[PDB]
Design a protein around this ligand. Structure first.
Ligand code: CLA
Ligand code: CLA
Ligand code: CLA
Ligand code: CLA
Ligand code: CLA
Ligand code: CLA
Ligand code: CLA
Ligand code: CLA
Ligand SMILES: CC1=C(/C=C/C(C)=C/C=C/C(C)=C/C=C/C=C(C)/C=C/C=C(C)/C=C/C2=C(C)CCCC2(C)C)C(C)(C)CCC1
Ligand SMILES: CC1=C(/C=C/C(C)=C/C=C/C(C)=C/C=C/C=C(C)/C=C/C=C(C)/C=C/C2=C(C)CCCC2(C)C)C(C)(C)CCC1
Ligand SMILES: CC1=C(/C=C/C(C)=C/C=C/C(C)=C/C=C/C=C(C)/C=C/C=C(C)/C=C/C2=C(C)CCCC2(C)C)C(C)(C)CCC1
Lengths: 176, 137, 158, 159, 33, 137
């Protein structure tokens, strides 16, 4: 198929990265899908926090003296406190990510394919439909979440509205 | 007397059995370090090394960093230590993947991988513990 | 044992009370270990007492520079705690030493495995250490005693 | 026990595991207790070692006042006791070898209470009768001291 | 605009060179192909 | 391994049982101590300033002196290091903690007492979960 031909072309082009799992491989698909699912959760949470003002709001910008020149955007301007708060909520997960990437739990799925092993078989257009905590359900939901992120971002960019406001427009306008 | 004799009783090797090189003090001190101690899984060796080197590293960034005079000096130092630890674990992983390519003694692909995972966990633990200690002192 | 270092002296072997007369080798080794530990600690203690008495004090101990027993108070509890930690770390190292098969009392340098051959000069120098250490033990206890009884303190006609 | 008589009770008489460890515990308790009682007496009649202790009603309340004033002394004493016990473990008890639970079996051929602390060879190990009699004397004076320590805490109790 | 430099300069001066040097080090001493 | 397979659901397909029983026991013992932690203060009372006067709530986390958290982590680390020295280095094969020894000699007694500990610990896990539900849902 066309997808199979593209994957074969990638394998020929970059055998090392494909072997390690980097690139168009099912392990990468699963990892990105899991990340995108958590990302949808986090965007919903960010919207809720913005609605309830849990975030310090853009009214307040971090002080240069305390947070140094990293807080500096352009010249006098400084990163807003809301952007910093979201960035830190992300930094927690990134620290977790490094910890679990270099020191994975024995039963956990490794980030990269083990040297001996090879990538798992391709799922296909419609992954095998089985409910419950089964690999197929996880992969299907990850694909759905990534597609959703793509198309909501497309909506926000085309219309020009903020991504969070576009998310608000969906649902029943519960968030903000 | 004569306290300098050829190492291993082999006069033609490039070494000497000086008091620093081969004395009960140094043999016992180095033989109990995690890098050379007996009966340790490579994961434990890495964990010990990381714990030693993480707690050790927060201080310089905390006290001599650009934000040393700000009220957030300790957190900046901790973050710098974390970043440097991440860099060093990248270095360790690449060294392992380059050196030993064709659980055991530490000189193997799996042994070195376990050592590096242990080192990362222990280094983050040491940095976190140093932060916890310095947070109230 | 009479052969182990320290014997050379005007008194020769000095064991009025019988302590090594029938002591097993383990007990004689422990006695020698204690003698050397006390002697080295006393040598350092006397040197430090001389340093403090002469007014030589670290920049971080500016106020107290006259009487050592008085200076001991200026050290906070955590300073003594760190002294104890350092001494315990060294003691742990030495304990790790004593597990090695060929250990001789106080030979934390592993002289047996280092010297090309056992020698009389080495024994004489070990005896020099032991003698200066015994003198340092007596001198240090005497310093503390003479300064406790007469508070004037050494270098003040004591 | 005392003389050639038997124990005064049920007396763990059915201990399949040898009583050597219990006898070691008895002699240790007794040595601690006799040191404790003799100390207590001297303290009650003489107390120069730690001045500025204010008023000490009896030896029982002295530890509290020392903790209040000389806190570091109890840390030093605990260190000494702990290191001494660890050092003893070497020449008493059998080491772990995937079995022999630690501090569980006195090493074979070792009479309980023997740490080697015989500097003046006052008790002649060669003379079995004399050494055994002196061991019995130590054990009995120690039992008496163990009773006496509580009999003295009665001094705390009355007031 | 006015936000990109903060995002990119660290990537171009730290992350990009770090990963590039890691990969080059792997390839130089690969010992095969 | 020593509870018998009456498990409600399947999770053991992709996870080794030896480590999972060890985790069951660790979490259960910690949960028992935590249930006591959230009962005994309320029933018997808190006994010092605590750096801020509060009880019966999780907020103590922030109120407690970081000194305590540091020392508690040190204690847990050292005890876990000793427990690791057992069962994975020296393979002592006798229980790590048994002063005033219990744990009968017969194997069946071992199994029964292990089952008892597992039950008391699972109940404590549920109790602690219900406590956290009381607190912060
Ligand atoms: C540039 C050099 C440098 C600098 C600025 C520091 C700075 C610091 N160190 Mg580090 N340290 C260094 C080198 C350095 N260290 C080296 C070379 C070693 C030996 C390998 C250590 C070993 C060390 C230990 C073991 C400890 C410190 C601690 C500390 C802190 C002491 C002050 C305090 O209690 O906090 C207020 C401070 C943040 C202590 C700490 O983290 O504070 C609790 C601590 O426990 N350091
Ligand atoms: C920090 C921890 C630490 C540890 C683990 C050890 C461990 C040890 N020491 Mg070391 N030592 C330490 C700190 C430590 N020491 C310090 C801080 C000092 C003072 C500088 C010494 C001075 C010292 C000497 C001089 C000797 C030891 C000895 C010993 C061994 C026997 C210990 C014993 O049974 O104590 C039991 C402790 C006592 C019975 C207390 C004795 C107090 C004396 C009689 C008078 C005290 C007067 C007053 C306090 C001043 C053991 C290897 C002995 C050894 O190796 O011989 C086998 C030995 O001779 N140590
Ligand atoms: C038995 C050994 C011994 C003991 C228990 C002490 C104990 C003490 N000394 Mg002394 N000291 C000693 C040996 C000793 N010292 C020796 C050998 C020297 C020569 C280098 C000194 C030089 C010295 C100075 C210059 C000062 C002290 C001070 C002190 C006090 C604070 C600790 C300190 O700053 O150490 C400092 C330790 C060193 C500078 C080096 C130690 C080197 C080791 C032994 C190796 C404390 C009462 C200070 C104090 O309170 O004022 C009087 C102080 O100003 N001591
Ligand atoms: C912690 C304290 C302690 C410990 C471990 C022991 C342990 C022991 N005692 Mg001792 N005993 C103690 C306190 C202690 N006793 C006190 C306070 C007294 C005074 C009343 C005695 C008086 C005593 C006698 C008179 C005898 C024992 C005997 C025994 C042994 C077995 C019989 C038994 O348990 O009773 C056992 C080794 C018996 C023994 O040694 O059997 C050979 C024996 O005859 N005990
Ligand atoms: C279980 C035993 C025990 C315990 C817990 C204590 C505990 C205490 N004693 Mg007592 N004491 C004891 C036995 C004991 N003592 C014995 C056997 C003696 C010999 C007569 C003394 C003589 C004594 C005097 C004269 C004084 C104390 C005091 C004290 C208090 C402060 C510590 C001190 O300076 O003690 C000093 C303790 C010793 C010198 C111990 C010597 C005997 C021990 C058991 C042998 C091994 C100890 C070790 C190797 C160090 C030896 C030092 C050397 C000078 C002999 C403290 C509550 C002081 C206090 O404030 O009382 C209210 C005080 O003035 N004690
Ligand atoms: C009534 C008092 C009393 C008596 C008669 C004994 C008698 C004895 N003790 Mg004991 N002892 C006592 C009090 C006593 N001790 C106290 C208060 C302590 C605490 C410091 C000790 C600590 C002690 C140790 C640590 C050791 C002895 C040992 C001995 C024996 C050595 C031979 C000898 O005495 O010389 C002997 C049976 C030694 C022994 O039996 O083994 C050789 C031995 O290792 N004793
Ligand atoms: C060779 C041409 C060239 C050069 C020297 C620079 C130089 C610079 N750019 Mg610019 N840039 C260029 C082309 C170039 N740019 C083009 C064509 C675009 C359109 C996409 C941009 C868009 C752009 C943005 C949006 C930003 C910069 C920024 C920067 C600065 C920091 C570097 C950085 O983060 O790069 C980021 C650049 C990219 C992610 C795109 C790559 C840039 C070119 C196309 C790569 C050319 C590679 C060259 C042929 C050599 C390859 C070999 C090399 C691997 C060794 C630096 C002054 C940043 C800045 O202003 O900081 C103050 C910043 O935020 N650049
Ligand atoms: C060209 C790109 C570049 C950039 C963007 C930076 C950025 C920075 N440098 Mg500079 N530096 C560079 C190149 C660069 N460096 C080069 C080439 C050298 C060698 C000549 C140096 C030498 C240097 C020194 C000597 C120092 C800096 C410091 C700093 C920090 C300034 C202090 C501050 O406000 O942060 C505050 C810092 C923190 C809050 C810590 C966060 C640290 C990182 C960003 C966390 C994430 C790291 C990440 C996990 C690593 C990924 C590894 C791998 C994938 C690449 C800042 C992050 C200072 C510093 O870090 O202070 C301690 C400092 O003292 N730099
Ligand atoms: C782990 C976690 C979790 C979970 C998570 C998850 C699981 C998530 C998921 C998520 C998701 C899962 C998401 C999704 C999303 C999706 C979307 C958003 C979609 C979209 C779609 C679209 C947009 C479409 C379009 C279209 C149409 C309209 C028709 C057809 C065709 C087209 C394509 C055109 C929790 C909670 C526990 C918490 C913590 C974290
Ligand atoms: C004495 C001295 C010396 C030396 C010294 C040194 C070298 C030091 C070092 C030091 C060090 C080097 C230290 C370290 C420390 C460390 C630590 C203390 C660690 C800790 C850790 C921890 C605590 C961890 C934890 C954890 C983990 C593991 C992970 C996460 C989680 C947790 C947090 C739990 C000499 C002789 C030369 C001279 C004189 C002085
Ligand atoms: C075997 C048996 C018996 C007996 C039992 C008994 C009667 C027991 C008892 C036991 C006891 C009854 C023991 C005791 C012990 C004691 C001790 C071990 C002590 C200690 C002491 C101390 C530690 C000290 C303290 C102090 C201080 C701290 C300062 C000053 C004051 C004083 C000195 C108080 C009979 C015959 C019935 C039979 C069956 C079994």
């Amino acid at each position: 198929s066309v997808f199979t031909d593209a994957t074969e072309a990638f394998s020929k082009d970059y055998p090392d990265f494909y072997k390690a799992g980097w690139g168009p491989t099912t392990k990468a698909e699963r990892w990105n899908g899991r990340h995108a699912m958590f990302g949808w959760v986090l965007i919903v949470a960010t919207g809720y926090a913005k609605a309830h003002g849990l975030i310090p709001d853009p009214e307040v910008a971090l002080n240069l003296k305390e947070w140094g020149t990293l807080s500096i955007l352009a010249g006098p301007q400084t990163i807003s406190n809301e952007r910093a708060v979201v960035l830190i909520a992300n930094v927690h997960a990134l620290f977790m990510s490094l910890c679990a990437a270099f020191a994975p739990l024995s039963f956990q799925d490794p980030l990269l394919i083990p040297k001996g092993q090879k990538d798992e078989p391709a799922a296909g257009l419609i992954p095998a439909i089985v409910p419950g905590l089964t690999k197929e359900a996880e992969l299907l939901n990850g694909r759905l979440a990534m597609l959703g992120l793509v198309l909501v971002m497309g909506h926000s960019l085309a219309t020009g509205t903020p991504f969070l406001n576009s998310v608000d427009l969906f649902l029943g306008n519960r968030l903000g | 007397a004569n306290f300098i004799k050829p190492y291993n009783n082999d006069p033609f090797v490039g070494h000497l059995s000086t008091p620093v090189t081969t004395s009960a003090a140094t043999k016992a001190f180095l033989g109990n370090l995690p890098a050379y101690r007996a009966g340790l899984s490579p994961l434990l060796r890495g964990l010990e090394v990381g714990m030693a080197h993480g707690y050790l590293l927060v201080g310089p960034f905390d006290k001599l960093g650009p934000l040393r005079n700000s009220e957030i000096a300790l957190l900046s130092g901790f973050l710098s230590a974390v970043g440097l630890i991440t860099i060093l674990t990248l270095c360790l992983t690449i060294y392992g993947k380059v050196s030993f390519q064709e659980n055991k003694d530490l000189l193997t692909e799996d042994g070195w991988s376990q050592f590096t995972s242990g080192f990362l966990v222990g280094a983050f633990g040491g940095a976190g513990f140093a932060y916890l200690t310095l947070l109230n002192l | 044992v009479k052969e182990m270092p320290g014997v050379s002296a005007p008194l020769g072997f000095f064991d009025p009370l019988g302590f090594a007369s029938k002591a097993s080798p383990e007990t004689i080794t422990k006695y020698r270990e204690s003698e050397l530990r006390h002697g080295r600690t006393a040598m350092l203690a006397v040197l430090g007492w001389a340093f403090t008495e002469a007014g030589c004090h670290l920049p971080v101990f500016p106020n107290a520079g006259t009487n050592p027993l008085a200076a001991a108070g200026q050290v906070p509890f955590w300073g003594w705690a760190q002294i104890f930690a350092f001494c315990g770390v060294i003691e742990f190292v030495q304990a790790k030493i004593r597990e090695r098969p060929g250990f001789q009392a106080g030979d934390y340098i592993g002289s047996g495995d280092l010297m090309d051959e056992g020698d009389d000069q080495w024994k004489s120098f070990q005896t020099k250490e032991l003698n200066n250490g015994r003198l340092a033990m007596l001198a240090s206890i005497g310093l503390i005693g003479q300064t406790a009884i007469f508070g004037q303190n050494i270098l003040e006609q004591s | 026990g005392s003389s050639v008589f038997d124990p005064l009770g049920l007396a763990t008489k059915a201990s399949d595991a040898e009583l050597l460890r219990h006898q070691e515990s008895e002699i240790k308790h007794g040595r601690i207790a006799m040191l404790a009682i003799l100390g207590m007496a001297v303290q009650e009649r003489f107390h120069p070692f730690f001045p500025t202790s204010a008023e000490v009603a009896n030896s029982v309340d002295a530890p509290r006042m020392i903790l209040q004033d000389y806190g570091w002394f109890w840390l030093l004493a605990l260190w000494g006791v702990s290191v001494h016990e660890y050092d003893n473990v070497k020449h008493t008890y059998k080491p772990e070898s995937s079995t022999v639970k630690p501090y569980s079996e006195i090493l074979d051929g070792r009479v309980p209470g023997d740490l080697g602390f015989d500097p003046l060879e006052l008790g002649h190990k060669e003379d079995s009768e004399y050494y055994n009699s002196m061991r019995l004397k130590e054990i009995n004076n120690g039992r008496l001291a163990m009773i006496a320590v509580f009999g003295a805490c009665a001094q705390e109790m009355v007031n | 605009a006015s936000y990109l430099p903060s995002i990119l300069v660290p990537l171009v001066g730290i992350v990009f060179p770090g990963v590039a040097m890691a990969l080059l080090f792997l390839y130089i001493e690969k010992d095969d192909i | 391994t020593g509870n018998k397979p009456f498990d409600p659901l399947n999770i053991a397909a992709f996870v080794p049982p030896e480590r999972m029983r060890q985790s069951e026991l660790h979490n259960g013992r910690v949960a028992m101590l935590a249930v006591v932690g959230w009962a005994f203060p309320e029933l018997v009372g808190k006994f010092a300033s605590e750096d801020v006067t509060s009880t019966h709530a999780l907020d103590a986390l922030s109120q407690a002196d970081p000194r305590f958290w540091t020392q508690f982590i040190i204690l847990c680390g050292i005890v876990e290091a000793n427990m690791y020295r057992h069962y994975q280095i020296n393979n002592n094969q006798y229980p790590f903690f048994d002063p005033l020894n219990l744990y009968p000699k017969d194997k069946a007694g071992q199994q029964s007492m292990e089952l008892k500990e597992l039950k008391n610990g699972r109940a404590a896990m549920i109790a602690f979960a219900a406590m956290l539900a009381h607190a912060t849902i």
